[PDB]
Paper text:
Human [name] (hBest1) is a [name]+-activated Cl− channel essential for Cl− transport in retinal pigment epithelium (RPE). Although the structure of hBest1 is still unsolved, two Best1 homolog structures, one from bacteria [name] (KpBest) and the other from chicken (cBest1), have been previously reported. Overall, the channel is a pentameric assembly with a single ion-conducting pathway, which varies in diameter along its length and is constrained at two narrow points: a “neck” contributed by three residues (I62/I66/F70 in KpBest and I76/F80/F84 in hBest1/cBest1) on a transmembrane helix, and an “aperture” formed by a single residue (I180 in KpBest1, I205 in hBest1, and V205 in cBest1) on a cytosolic helix. Here, by electrophysiological and structural analyses, we show that the neck and aperture in hBest1 are both indispensable [name]+-dependent gates, and their dysregulated opening by rationally designed or patient-derived mutations causes [name]+-independent leak and elevates [name]+-dependent channel activity.
Twelve identical residues shared between KpBest and hBest1 on the loop structures within the channel core transmembrane regions were identified as the subjects of alanine substitution, as we reasoned that replacing conserved residues on the (relatively flexible) loops, rather than substitution on the rigid helices, are more likely to be informative without disrupting the overall channel structure. Alanine substitution mutants for each of the 12 residues were generated in KpBest and hBest1 and subjected to crystallography and patch clamp, respectively. All 12 KpBest mutants were purified with a size exclusion profile indistinguishable from the WT, suggesting that the overall integrity of the channel is still retained after alanine substitution. Eleven of the 12 KpBest mutant structures were solved, while 10 of the 12 hBest1 mutants displayed altered channel function.
Author numbering:
A (entry chain D), C (entry chain A): 22 to 289
B (entry chain B): 22 to 293
D (entry chain E): 24 to 294
E (entry chain C): 22 to 291
């Protein structure tokens, strides 16, 4: 909460305004409420639309992760339904699917996958994966080798191969989606503009309130600031969905659910 | 709603400002309207967006439930159309599909699936299902085994297997979509912030209103407070569409519909 | 057009405020514009968001019906192009597709589909359909059966069977969508809340306008009221897409269009 | 539009040279009520313009799909049946006829010349006989693909890959039809237009109090804002209406013709 | 983004309003705030909706480019998984997929693709591609011949050919979406209204503010103009996402990422 300092700096800005209202006539400065209404409203409208975009970006992240669990569940389901004997293949594929999740998590958090990957895969595979500048993509390529092998060994027909291939595509879209969200921020200009504007607004506001509210100036002014600043900071918290804040996605729990899910489906 | 408390708790504070308005003088308190116009409009705008976000959650949730019915209807149709004679599988698969929907409702209402499960499937299966930490998924896996067995037995080809396989994917997307709406709400700041704000605004509003309205003050403040608080609680309601409030989804009716659909006439169908 | 009732009731509410404006401050009752601008604005925002939802639900009802035409057109096309010889199957499948439309209309309007079904299908099939607790869904099953026969008789392969099965899936999505829309209104609370506030607001309004407009009160309180009610009433006129009112979907004409189209494509 | 700005100036001058008589009599117009009205209308115009915009965008997407589907079908024909140039040419004909015919259908203009240039007279009579000419064209494109399958030049699989493209065109056809026979509101766009229209005419009277001579200036600026927003919605609401901008629809049908002649090597001219 | 010119011209207009407020009474002109408030809020609402549309277009554009990378990655994945031995095919298709991306960037920027094409493909292919009303389209058709030839040679079945066909189908959709976003400014009613509107409003605002603020006019007037103009020009940037403004897609970087991914997946080293 940087908000609380911003509130107290605003109570102080109001005192400065009461004490200084005297020399207003002298200095030749009069400030009515009316234009601050115009400005405040304008700012609230833009804050509303901005916040809308931030929430949508957070929702997209959530959906992207939702697909991971859906597509992995159904790939394992398919593997069991189509090749119920082939538990060798099941185990290999499930570990790739589980690696994909953790890999994706680490990629977005800008952290080290080595532990999670080493915990899941053989060494001849882990070094291949960490070798690529696109590890997560590499895990998908390898999961693909698995299904292709079962195809070449005639365990899968072209059709059944096709069914599982679609699920890798789904995972591909998730990877791209997340990378896209990670690297493409909501234009910095939104935070640039609005952060400036909101701060300057809350700051100048008591200077305009004072003529009308006098000593009441602090109370009302801090209230209006709390409304604006709270809404503005909610946008901020929603904007980095892949971060570590408690307000961000619990990527760790999500990857756990995924792992436990795929292990449950295989009996582990 | 649960608004009449705070609507009354507000008629009080509105008399206070009719008794106080001459004493503003003495204490040193001026309070025009225009600042409260500004603050009120801002809150309206934010209430607007919040409510819209809440409704989308409602609508998505309704849609995900819609797909359960569609996807189950079409899977049964496919089984009837492609394997018209295989009533044993028809029956097995339908009860899994019916279990699926009830199981999903229990999952989301945080209630016990056992009664509904036992009503539909044999007990060894009820224990396979309850054994899992994700029972709905387990029912899907079991439904899939039914389809896969018909395939291993060469009653389905790969193509016709895949037609049915698609429908199970559709249901997996419902499960996933539903879990996503349930585990994560709209981040808890949303409700914490807005409720504080709307109410704080509502109580102070008359203190600033009197000077203009004089006597008509407590009315025109309760009217405004109704509007703001109405909107805020409806949002709070729709936000949790698997809840049990009046404006949430009728999940029990929806599973009843699904059930009556699949089991329509002791499960009997015209044969091609 | 009960709107012109409320407009008239409004002219009357002006006139009591015009003449009763005297005894106002003696009582101590004042109504300024400013707080009614706050309410008016807040209500307009909520009216906006709401009518939005109303509009979307109506657009969805059109889209769904639109898909009937699209999917039935394309199923008929596929049958002509894949099985040009097989006019018997053509005519059967077409009568089911036409029955489906009419049946869906009857279900949404809660009317008796019997005559239409009897004009299109043999009595036995009608009996099958009407015996079901879900007749329209049963029409899909029968059409599926016709397609299934073609498959058994090897006139269709699995692949081409599949191309046509996809179309019955689309019709399934239409049927579910309509059912969902029919049983899921825009939540009542919206219409409740808003009808209270809009009604009370347009009532209390010439009161809060008279001490500003005096003799221009009626002509301005009514123009404002017509504006809120016009816009509140656009919701009313969009919330019953399946109805028979002038502003509701012309489902009979759309059903004729569907039938006319399928008959054009089979040269009847 | 510019007629209603000239009327606004006229009403503004009336406002000044009449402000005298009427406020003396008991009949007053303040700014605050017309400010609540105007903001409400602005809000409504906002939501209205949102719905309009999204019908405009839907029309662009549908037409976008024609370009995409037609390109990919022809690509599929070349990649899968490289040698069947006669089929390539017939199919491209129908594809191009489909576009032009859709455009004609939406703009309620005559497709005859486009059909006669593109197809044999037998087919043109057949297509013109139908009450659903565009759908009939898709059906004929269908027969082409169908015959290639009958002759065992397409397998059921590869027939299917091409069939999808025809379905995409089916979706476009119906989507556009639905966008055309609209709107959805009924004669309520006439209500909000008149609401804006009346609001802009009463407004100088409500302003003259505060602005006197400045009235016509500030009044016409405001009127302009509302009337512009309103008429932009009118345009957007009706992408296929009788007074629409036909430049991009014509651009699209030309692009696709051009693209397909390119893909089938009917372009460039030979050396 | 010569926005500061518009702001300074606004500070100027403010002084013009102060110095001329003296003559104000004498000339016979009154200008209250309340009517400018009405217009101002209207315009704000309009900028709100407008800006939101612009953002949407930008997000769509970004998404489409997202799909290039996804679809191309997965095409190469299918090629390796299904035809592990056909490394010639691997290389030729990859150079088409890489040519596709750069060619798309060129198309959208209206620049010449000749250099990049020549870097990636034999000259015969370059000539074929350059000869076409739509080079990206021709590139997809060439990629299509590759998998087509593999199908002809019975190295792909109809089904596995189809799986790969779908990916080219996806690229066609991307191509179309980008064409649509690039040739869809809309009717230039977003300049006759929003740009000049906001502009005029901002310069008349001080004339209207001055009776109330006196010397404070330019401070308040600048703050309000900043707010509106910031909002407006950000819309402008977002509206044209394939442009070269600050806030427009780094298409060259996105193309490099694409190329690098595809090179990574097929054994090769940048
Ligand atoms: Cl899936
Ligand atoms: Cl296993
Ligand atoms: Cl389905
Ligand atoms: Cl279709
Ligand atoms: Cl026939
Ligand atoms: Cl026929
Ligand atoms: Cl396509
Ligand atoms: Cl050719
Ligand atoms: Cl050719
Ligand atoms: Cl893909
Ligand atoms: Zn899926
Ligand atoms: Zn296993
Ligand atoms: Zn082993
Ligand atoms: Zn490391
Ligand atoms: Zn489906
Ligand atoms: Zn049965
Ligand atoms: Zn009093
Ligand atoms: Zn379709
Ligand atoms: Zn026939
Ligand atoms: Zn009705
Ligand atoms: Zn496509
Ligand atoms: Zn050719
Ligand atoms: Zn050309
Ligand atoms: Zn004067
Ligand atoms: Zn894809
Ligand atoms: Zn290779």
């Amino acid at each position: 909460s940087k908000i609380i300092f911003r509130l107290l700096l605003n109570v102080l800005m109001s005192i400065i305004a009461i004490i200084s209202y005297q020399w207003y006539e002298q200095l030749g400065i009069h400030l009515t409420v009316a234009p601050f209404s115009l400005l405040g409203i304008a700012i609230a409208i833009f804050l509303g639309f901005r916040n809308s975009a931030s929430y949508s970006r957070f929702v997209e992240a959530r959906n992207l992760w939702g697909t991971v669990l859906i597509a992995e569940r159904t790939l394992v389901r398919q593997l069991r339904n189509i090749l119920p004997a082939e538990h060798d293949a099941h185990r290999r594929i499930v570990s790739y699917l589980v690696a994909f999740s953790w890999s994706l998590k680490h990629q977005l958090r800008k952290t080290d996958p080595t532990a999670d990957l080493r915990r899941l895969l053989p060494e001849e595979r882990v070094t291949e994966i960490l070798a690529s500048s696109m590890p997560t993509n590499r895990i998908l390529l390898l999961a693909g080798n698995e299904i292709g092998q079962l195809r070449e060994a005639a365990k899968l027909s072209d059709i059944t191969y096709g069914l599982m291939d679609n699920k890798l595509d789904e995972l591909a879209h998730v990877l791209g989606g997340c990378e896209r969200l990670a690297t493409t921020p909501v234009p910095f200009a939104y935070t640039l503009i609005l952060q400036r504007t909101v701060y300057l607004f809350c700051t100048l506001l008591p200077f305009a309130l004072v003529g009308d509210l006098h000593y009441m100036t602090p109370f009302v002014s801090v209230f209006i600031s709390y409304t604006f600043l709270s809404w503005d900071s909610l946008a901020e918290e929603l904007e980095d969905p892949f971060g570590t804040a408690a307000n961000d996605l619990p990527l760790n729990a999500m990857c756990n659910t995924i792992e436990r899910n795929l292990l449950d489906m295989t009996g582990q």
